[PDB]
Design a protein around this nucleic acid. Structure first.
Ligand SMILES: Nc1ncnc2c1ncn2[C@@H]1O[C@H](COP(=O)(O)CP(=O)(O)OP(=O)(O)O)[C@@H](O)[C@H]1O
Ligand SMILES: [Mg+2]
Ligand SMILES: [Zn+2]
Ligand SMILES: [Zn+2]
Ligand SMILES: [Zn+2]
Lengths: 84, 171, 557, 178, 97, 112, 107, 269
DNA sequence: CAAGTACTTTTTCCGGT
RNA sequence: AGGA
DNA sequence: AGTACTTG
């Protein structure tokens, strides 16, 4: 159905699985010569660049957290706490 | 006829395009793929309306390749001809078999037999014409046709038409 | 590799199970399938317009498919068909067919009970098709008469007509592939003593099922769109293509046909006899003969291992491989080829312990690293490095095996006349050797643990064994009395992350199985750590300085 | 990949009925009267008379030329050449269909000005005729109520002959003297 | 080597969704079939070159999709069909929940 | 509920008899699974494998062909929600890494 | 409620669903000697109001299928006289959390 | 079978444990909503000993000249004497501790104190002690309000379930119960001052780290807890192979099979 | 009706009759 | 027939 | 070595 931003009840924290999937996706993208939203401070590994993008919180992705009924909450990698 | 229709193409963007000029490359890929297109289901997709308000939505990243898939929701001018539709057009082709009529994006071919009997072919004219006691149907001439049936054919739609009944024929 | 197709890519969301209507089989079919002969255009080696390819899939590997012009690796097979002379039971459905007959009128095709019986409308209520059919059967099996009129939903004095036909129902019993019933009869109130004993034909059960009401069969587990009862009886048979039953073609002049290809020809032969036998001089019994043989072949094709003992044995005594046999557990399609699979980018050797390896690394023998490849994309960040590994080639350690182009076509650096001058372009892929620090999945079978498969850092080393840190020994349950282990190389930037970010050895240290560390100091190090730490134990400067320099993180203090 | 619509039918296994399309106002599944805009709301069928459609496309490409030049920052015989120029500027060129269409509409339109197409759209959308008939009445020039009731046979019982003749008379006045 | 049933479990246990996919697809079996959107079967006569598609028996020349499945699953489905069962594959839902 | 209590107690005792320690939650979950149906659902082909999960999922243990035959007869619909169904289909299973979706937001992309 | 010593004739048993909307319950005296609800292993079951169930399902985004089930013949479902569809809230002590709330729908 | 029976079970984004049919198995994973690796055996002090020993450990009476906190324990010690308003707070505190103690004895019938719970409090305090160089001689700069209310606030922040409704909120309260019994027991006023000797600075740090640790300790929606449970029972069973009642592998076999005709049926009266 | 019967999943992954 |  | 099933 798609749950509104006010009314979102899932964790404000990013899941171990979310973080891994984001780093993977961005590494795969950077590696496919996608634009990088961070200064590569001499960086060359797309995974190492992905960590830097997630650290500077400059990853233009969104996690769609599906619920067992089918509904979902959308969360920006920007808004997700990284205590991981 | 000539309708305005709400349609939605799915586009698949390669990661190297995830720059700020994204919505722009997308809106264009839609226009490349969709405008000029001819489908049986919707007819000729002619002109994509309201460029400024084309809906890109959030695009899902497909797991193994980094590409993202977007459902580009849009609105366009279409042309889906029907049997029984009365159309006006200009003649183009003309032979012993009949004459073809250009109607917007599509041609309609009128059979020698789908015309009144009085109209006879004339090979010895420039360009080859169809002659009646009153009328002379030829290349640049304007004609009102009734579409008898159409054939959905790849990048086009073609139809067989009549000028035999009342109020049809030369204009 | 498969070629570009303009068809939209999508994923399977639902699997809609069902049965084939004969009409569908005929419709989907690319040919029927008249001659049991496989090919030889009268000895002339080329496929026949009769069995395997009267427009089906392709053989030869040379020479493309007729109907899709694709050829071998692209062409899924194409189905054909065999219009059976007489109907036959599907081996699988035999008991459901029986149970349905036991529930319905063997004459009018109406349910033996209805909305009028209390227990029946009670059973009809059940939402679960499987559980409701179970209930319907147990009530209806008993009812041995189709009722014309029954007591009304108010009083027994006035009885309402439910639906016609009075006929006594047979007491059906199976005699392996045949349904034979026993009608109680009536004769002067008595009979039975001695009831009517006659076998129920496929064709009669078909006609009763054909007459079962949509509402009626739908009250049984059935579905008017995907699975009608009549479809449990086979009329027109789908002939699977070569990809399903490939000919293991030894030499150039030798067939090597599949078991399925032979059993199909048996069916054809059994069918042809029956057809001519009835069309021609019909010696009445000689037909029920050839019919029962056709039933047998169509039975043993789908399932050879039937209760009713006679196994269809190949001329050699060895029995025929049924289709059911192909799908049966551990080894065979499901558990054998789908749940588990043999895989590329995998290596296996003897393991040995190394105190000089870090907990999270794995000693990878050079030879293994020079075989296992990772497909790296040509990017500006790596362009120069990759250009050098390609230059190095397949036999230098930091080297490459292939260069994959934009074109999709694979360059072999082992033979390509251009293996030297190979100018790399962004977006190409270089299949480079496995290198120090690449994450790899390490595993020791059994594999009863989350920790029996952990990700390690490559460490290319000499000698032919995989080297592992000693503390990592416990989660794997490994020892070095000759144990071997498996290595798996991820081919994606995405899968590599999964491994480093989730299954890495250090992540696995504390285990949820018992909420405590699953790795610790073991053997030599445990034995020596006690000895080193006694009150009695003092060390002189000379050694103290070496004991220090050895800690790679020592403050220099 | 090809285009899809707002109609969400689930033809599960059951293929057909492929019903014919006519002057029984029996158009496709797609060109049905009860349509649905992407906002989900039920909206009615939009059929355009040549004159109306000529303006729509012209308008669209005009504003597309605006957006293109914005993103590049950091007399019927004459209307024909004017249009052929705008097409070089906005459309992919490869679209021979649009050039052919615009030439056709430019040469076949009855109502040249926006205000003219306005009054046509008002006068007609009061009859209660299905947007297809309302378009054909606007795009085919008719004199007898018979001429119209013949070429648009669906009209047959829908309007009065005299009422249709009043309407045909107003449309004839509205014809922009090219 | 065999990435077996048990090994599949450890992968499921880790939550390595893509790594499991990769082992079972790209690193083994993986194949491309064309399926009909009306009867969810591999019926399609994909003459991918002349860009012709077709599913005679549905007369469908439009509603066709390409899917990526293990060749052994292509096999399983053809085997299930030879035995009269229909494993119809659909790229959209109809049940919700 | 006392069934769950007894069942757990007994399970725990087999584990603790060896001297081993398995954290509550693992045994709790097994016991909870056998329970939820309202009775004592055994961990056998004729027990759990006869529940209403996916036809393909169920055929992947013990009754294979027999299960699939029944699916075709009763026109069963596989949800494709189970792990095993995606494993068969060569699809990214809704497990860990696949339990949610990933999308590009154009707004944030043009913001950076 | 009808508390009987040894048996109830199948003649008399046919008159139990005879008077709806009113309801009847049979009970063997021998079973009633000990109150099972008093046992160590027996947690607090609580019958929910039609509005409470409505909320439980809304709050957990459930269909009635999805909840754990209690059999209509369960000693505790008998003690409380649970009817088909009626939901029980079970409150057990936890070595994990100290207090754990489960739910069971009636069969 | 254990694997095949539990394969499709995982923790969803509503902290709920469900199968491939979305049926609820457990309302919250392991009844507490905690990831197993983040748990450690911890002694619940409150649980045992004499009612007398408890009183000495937890009781603070600012209205009694003998049972106040000596002005050596904290700075306010002098001015805290006979303060009736504060004494209300310590009475709430004490009565809550006694409630806990009775409840714990209901759960752990045999008085077993050692239970695995998340957040090792003993370490946080130990670490605060070296981090801040705690002087076991000097008086603390803590208020009775600073401790009593401080603990009371942290409790509202140990979040497992997030929903804005009574149903979900009670689930949260319930799931967090036992942990808070430990929290209140290890963080009582008398204890913090007399035993730990913390400063306001150190106490604030202890409090933030409990919060932080607790949040890190919750299960991650995605966890295939079914397979994990199967393997976590299965693996040990393989390692036990590779009144004298049937036990080990064969009794486990008896169990999973729900075997009717069991080998050694026995009643304990 | 019961006894005694067949099947079945009956641990995993790695030279050649 | 062998291997952990 | 067990379980529903099957056949006497
Ligand atoms: N049939 C089998 N199937 C699966 N794993 C097996 C197996 N046989 C042996 N193993 C594995 O190999 C390990 C070693 O067994 P053995 O080679 O006999 C030496 P050990 O019994 O462990 O005693 P030791 O360490 O004091 O010498 C086992 O613990 C087990 O994991
Ligand atoms: Mg060994
Ligand atoms: Zn082919
Ligand atoms: Zn009858
Ligand atoms: Zn089809």
């Amino acid at each position: 159905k798609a749950i509104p931003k006010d009314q979102r009840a899932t964790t404000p924290y990013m899941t171990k699985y979310e973080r891994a999937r984001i780093l993977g996706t961005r590494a795969l993208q950077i590696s496919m010569n996608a634009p990088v939203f961070v200064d590569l401070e001499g960086e060359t590994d797309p995974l190492r660049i992905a960590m830097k993008e997630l650290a500077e919180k400059k990853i233009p992705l969104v996690i769609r957290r599906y619920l067992p009924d089918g509904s979902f909450e959308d969360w920006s990698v920007e808004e997700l706490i990284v205590d991981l | 006829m000539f309708f305005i229709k709400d349609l939605s193409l799915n586009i698949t963007l390669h990661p190297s395009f995830f720059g700020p000029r994204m919505k722009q490359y997308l809106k264009t890929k839609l226009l490349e793929e969709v405008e000029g297109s001819c489908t049986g289901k919707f007819g000729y997709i002619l002109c994509v309306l309201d460029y400024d308000n084309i809906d890109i939505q959030r695009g899902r990243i497909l797991p193994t390749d980094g590409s993202a898939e977007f459902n580009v929701k849009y609105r366009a001018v279409v042309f889906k001809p029907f049997k029984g539709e009365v159309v006006d057009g200009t003649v183009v082709s003309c032979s012993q078999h009949g004459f073809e009529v250009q109607v917007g994006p599509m041609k309609v071919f009128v059979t020698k037999h789908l015309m009144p009997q009085d109209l006879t072919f004339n090979a010895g004219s420039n360009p080859p014409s169809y002659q009646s006691s009153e009328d002379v149907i030829t290349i640049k001439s304007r004609i009102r046709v009734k579409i008898e049936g159409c054939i959905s054919q790849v990048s086009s739609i073609h139809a067989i038409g009549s000028i035999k009944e009342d109020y049809l024929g030369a204009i | 590799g498969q070629q570009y197709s303009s068809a939209p890519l999508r994923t399977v969301k639902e699997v809609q199970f069902g049965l084939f209507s004969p009409e569908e089989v005929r419709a989907i079919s690319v040919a029927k399938i008249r001659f049991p002969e496989t090919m030889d255009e009268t000895q002339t080696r080329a496929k026949i317009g009769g069995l395997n390819d009267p427009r089906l899939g392709s053989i030869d590997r040379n020479l493309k498919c007729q109907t899709c012009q694709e050829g071998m690796n692209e062409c899924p097979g194409h189905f054909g068909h065999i219009d059976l002379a007489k109907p036959v039971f599907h081996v699988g459905f035999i008991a459901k067919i029986k149970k349905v007959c036991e529930c319905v009128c063997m004459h009018c095709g109406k349910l033996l009970l209805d909305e009028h019986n209390e227990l029946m409308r009670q059973a009809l209520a059940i939402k679960d098709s499987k559980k409701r059919f179970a209930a319907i059967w147990t009530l209806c099996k008993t009812k041995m008469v189709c009722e014309t009129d029954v007591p009304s939903e108010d009083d027994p004095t006035q009885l309402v007509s439910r639906g016609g036909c009075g006929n006594t129902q047979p007491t059906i019993r199976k005699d392996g592939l045949k349904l034979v019933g026993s009608w109680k009869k009536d004769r002067a109130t008595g009979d039975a003593d001695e009831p009517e004993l006659r076998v129920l034909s496929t064709e009669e059960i078909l006609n009763i099922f054909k007459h079962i009401s949509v509402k009626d069969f739908t009250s049984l587990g059935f579905n008017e769109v995907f699975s009608r009862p009549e479809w449990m009886i086979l009329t027109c048979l789908p002939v699977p293509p070569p990809p399903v039953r490939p000919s293991i073609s030894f030499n150039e002049s030798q067939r090597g046909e599949d078991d399925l290809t032979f059993k199909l020809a048996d069916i054809l032969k059994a069918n042809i006899s029956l057809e001519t036998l009835e069309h021609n001089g019909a010696p009445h019994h000689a037909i029920e003969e050839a019919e029962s043989l056709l039933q047998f072949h169509v039975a043993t094709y789908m399932d050879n291992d039937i209760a009713g003992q006679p196994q269809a044995l190949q001329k050699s005594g060895r029995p025929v491989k049924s289709i059911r046999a192909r799908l049966k557990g551990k080894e065979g399609r499901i558990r054998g080829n789908l749940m588990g699979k043999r895989v590329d980018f995998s290596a296996r050797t003897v393991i040995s312990g190394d105190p000089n390896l870090e907990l999270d690394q794995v000693g990878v023998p050079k030879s293994i690293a020079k075989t296992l490849t990772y497909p790296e994309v040509v990017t500006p960040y790596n362009i120069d490095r990759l250009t050098q590994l390609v230059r190095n080639g397949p036999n230098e350690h930091p080297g490459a095996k292939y260069v994959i182009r934009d074109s999709g076509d694979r360059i072999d650096l082992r033979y390509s006349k251009r293996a030297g001058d190979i100018q790399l372009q962004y977006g190409w892929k270089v299949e480079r050797h496995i290198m120090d620090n690449d994450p790899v999945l390490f595993n020791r079978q059994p594999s009863l643990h989350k920790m029996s498969m952990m990700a390690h850092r490559v460490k290319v080393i000499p000698y032919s064994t995989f080297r592992l840190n000693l503390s990592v020994t416990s989660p794997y349950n490994a020892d070095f009395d000759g144990d071997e282990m498996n290595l798996h190389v991820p081919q994606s930037e995405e899968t590599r992350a999964e491994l480093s970010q989730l299954c890495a050895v250090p992540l696995q240290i504390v285990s949820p199985q018992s909420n405590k560390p699953c790795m610790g100091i073991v053997q030599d190090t445990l034995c020596g750590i006690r000895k080193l730490t006694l009150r009695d134990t003092f060390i002189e400067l000379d050694q103290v300085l070496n004991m220090l320099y050895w800690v790679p993180d020592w403050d220099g203090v | 990949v090809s285009t899809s619509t707002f109609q969400t039918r689930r033809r599960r296994l059951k293929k057909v009925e492929e019903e014919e399309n006519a002057a029984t106002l029996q158009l496709g599944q797609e060109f049905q009267l009860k349509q649905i805009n992407h906002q989900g709301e039920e909206e009615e069928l939009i059929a355009l008379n040549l004159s109306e459609a000529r303006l729509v496309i012209k308008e669209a490409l005009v504003e597309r030329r605006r957006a293109f030049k914005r993103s590049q920052k950091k007399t019927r015989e004459k209307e024909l050449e004017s249009i052929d120029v705008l097409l070089e500027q906005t459309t992919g060129g490869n679209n021979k269909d649009l050039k052919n269409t615009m030439q056709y509409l430019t040469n076949f339109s009855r109502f040249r000005d926006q205000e003219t197409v306005g009054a046509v759209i008002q006068l007609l959308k009061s009859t209660g005729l299905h947007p297809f008939e309302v378009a054909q009445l606007g795009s085919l020039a008719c004199d007898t109520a018979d001429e119209a009731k013949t070429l648009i046979p669906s009209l047959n019982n829908k309007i009065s002959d005299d009422e249709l003749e009043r309407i045909l008379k107003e449309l004839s006045n509205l014809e922009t003297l090219y | 080597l065999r990435f077996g049933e048990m090994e599949r479990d450890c992968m499921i246990a880790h939550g390595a969704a893509s790594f499991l996919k990769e082992r079972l697809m790209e690193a083994s079996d993986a194949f491309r079939v064309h399926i009909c959107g009306i009867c969810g079967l591999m019926t399609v006569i994909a003459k991918l070159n002349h860009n012709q598609f077709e599913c005679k028996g549905c007369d469908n020349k439009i509603d066709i999709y390409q899917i990526h499945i293990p060749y052994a699953a292509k096999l399983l489905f053809q085997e299930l069909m030879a035995m009269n069962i229909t494993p119809r594959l659909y790229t959209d839902r109809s049940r919700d929940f | 509920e006392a069934g769950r209590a007894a069942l757990y107690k007994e399970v725990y005792n087999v584990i603790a008899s060896d001297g081993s320690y398995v954290n509550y939650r693992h045994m709790a979950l097994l016991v909870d699974v056998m329970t939820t149906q309202g009775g004592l659902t055994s961990v056998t082909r004729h027990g759990f494998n006869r529940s209403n999960t996916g036809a393909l999922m169920r055929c992947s243990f013990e009754e294979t062909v027999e299960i699939l035959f029944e699916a075709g007869a009763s026109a069963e619909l596989d949800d494709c929600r189970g792990v095993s169904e995606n494993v068969i289909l060569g699809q990214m299973a809704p497990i860990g890494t696949g339990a949610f979706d990933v999308m590009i937001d154009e707004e944030s992309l043009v913001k950076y | 409620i009808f508390v009987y010593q040894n048996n109830i004739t199948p003649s008399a048993m046919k008159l139990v669903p005879s008077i709806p909307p009113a309801t009847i319950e049979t009970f063997n005296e021998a079973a009633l000697v000990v109150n099972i609800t008093h046992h160590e292993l027996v947690p607090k079951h609580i019958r929910l109001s039609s509005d409470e169930k409505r909320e439980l399902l809304k709050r957990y985004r459930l269909k009635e299928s999805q909840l754990p089930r209690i059999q209509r013949a369960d000693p505790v479902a008998l003690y409380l006289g649970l009817k088909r569809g009626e939901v029980v809230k079970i409150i057990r002590k936890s070595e994990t959390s100290g207090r754990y709330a489960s739910y069971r729908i009636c069969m | 079978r254990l694997v095949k029976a539990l394969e499709d079970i995982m923790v969803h984004y509503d902290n709920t444990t469900r199968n491939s049919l979305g049926n609820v198995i457990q309302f919250i994973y392991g009844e507490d909503g905690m990831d197993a690796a983040h748990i450690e055996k911890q002694s619940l002090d409150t649980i045992g000993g004499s009612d007398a020993a408890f009183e000495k450990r937890y009781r603070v009476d600012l209205l009694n000249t003998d049972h106040t906190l000596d002005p050596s324990l904290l700075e306010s010690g002098s001015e805290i004497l006979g303060d009736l308003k504060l004494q209300v707070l310590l009475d709430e505190e004490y009565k809550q501790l006694v409630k806990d103690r009775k409840f714990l004895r209901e759960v752990f019938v045999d008085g077993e104190a050692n239970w695995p719970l998340p957040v090792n409090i003993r370490r946080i305090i130990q670490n605060a002690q070296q981090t801040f160089h705690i002087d076991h001689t000097k008086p603390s700069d803590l208020t009775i309000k600073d401790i009593v209310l401080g603990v009371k606030d942290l409790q509202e922040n140990l979040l497992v379930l997030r929903g804005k409704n009574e149903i979900i909120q009670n689930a949260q309260r319930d799931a967090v119960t036992l942990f808070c019994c430990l929290l209140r027991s290890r963080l009582a006023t008398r204890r913090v001052l007399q035993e730990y000797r913390l400063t306001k600075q150190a106490f604030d740090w202890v409090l933030s780290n409990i919060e932080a640790q607790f949040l890190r300790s919750v299960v991650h929606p995605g966890e295939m807890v079914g397979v994990l449970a199967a393997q976590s029972i299965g693996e040990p069973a393989t390692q036990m192979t590779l009144k004298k009642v049937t036990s080990g592998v064969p009794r486990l076999k008896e169990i999973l099979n729900v075997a009717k005709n069991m080998k050694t049926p026995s009643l304990t009266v």
